[PDB]
Symmetry: C2
Subunit: 181 residues, 2 copies
Amino acid sequence: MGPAFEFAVAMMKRNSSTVKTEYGEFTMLGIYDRWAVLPRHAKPGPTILMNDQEVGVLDAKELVDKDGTNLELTLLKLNRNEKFRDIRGFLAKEEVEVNEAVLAINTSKFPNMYIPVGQVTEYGFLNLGGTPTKRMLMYNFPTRAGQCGGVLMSTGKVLGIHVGGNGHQGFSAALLKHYFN
Amino acid sequence: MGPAFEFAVAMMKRNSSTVKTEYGEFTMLGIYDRWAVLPRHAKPGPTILMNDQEVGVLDAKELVDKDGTNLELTLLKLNRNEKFRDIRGFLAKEEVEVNEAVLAINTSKFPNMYIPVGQVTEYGFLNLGGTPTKRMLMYNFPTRAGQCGGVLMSTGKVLGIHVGGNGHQGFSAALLKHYFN
């Protein structure tokens, strides 16, 4: 748990930002170059607020699998000169399972907050608020609204982005290496 | 940071509860026997909700120093059969300073959330919302409302209870060994 916490804190400092769309305030993880990722429900428009500063969105891709099934991630390309620290080496080729994970949230509602969620298991298929979704990771913890966009991490691993919760169970979309490039 | 996180998580699981008074929802740390502590602003009445269950308060002491100066803690004795795990050995005799602290919050607004706040320094005197207060510990982090009652910890140390914030600076009341007994 401790090493996952130390990893998470470092990763958030280097790669995370707080973002506002017309649909809410979200934690945003920058991945490489000007590409970042948001939970699909963030529904980013032509401009976003990133750390309170207006930023143009050049492109947004709502990820689906080979059979059109929702993955609940949106990738976005930002109109900005600074490049994200390349973290693609921390992204797995397939859904990660770990014994000890932390979920990191960074918004106005949850400024630099970290939650131990314990074991992460590949859940896979889920009907997510009425939408069939795949590649879900599941973990047990008391889930609250505003946590959407949180970054799920263990030591040396970025596993996914928190996209939903129900009572005492949360779900992340797996953040896979091949989604980038 | 990691060891402080692991310590905090263990301590919260064993000794913390979520409490509602007429004045709000607070994280509550149980100390020994049936004695617990709340930020003074919790203003506990004759009954509290502790983990959603009504609990009678036998006694509440609003702590002041030898010259009547506010310390911003209330100690409360609970009408309940279960005894808290005695954590008085984790309480210092005097205001603690550390290089790496975590603030742990456990309420509906912030369920099992942990914040790295870095360095804790003895601030001492503070005019706290119009009230002269002493024995304050200070740390820098983006403070939000609802964090009152959070438990400030480092590895093997319970330092104090979060009682206030202003922008990017928070304050805890030092939780001293002699307050108990």
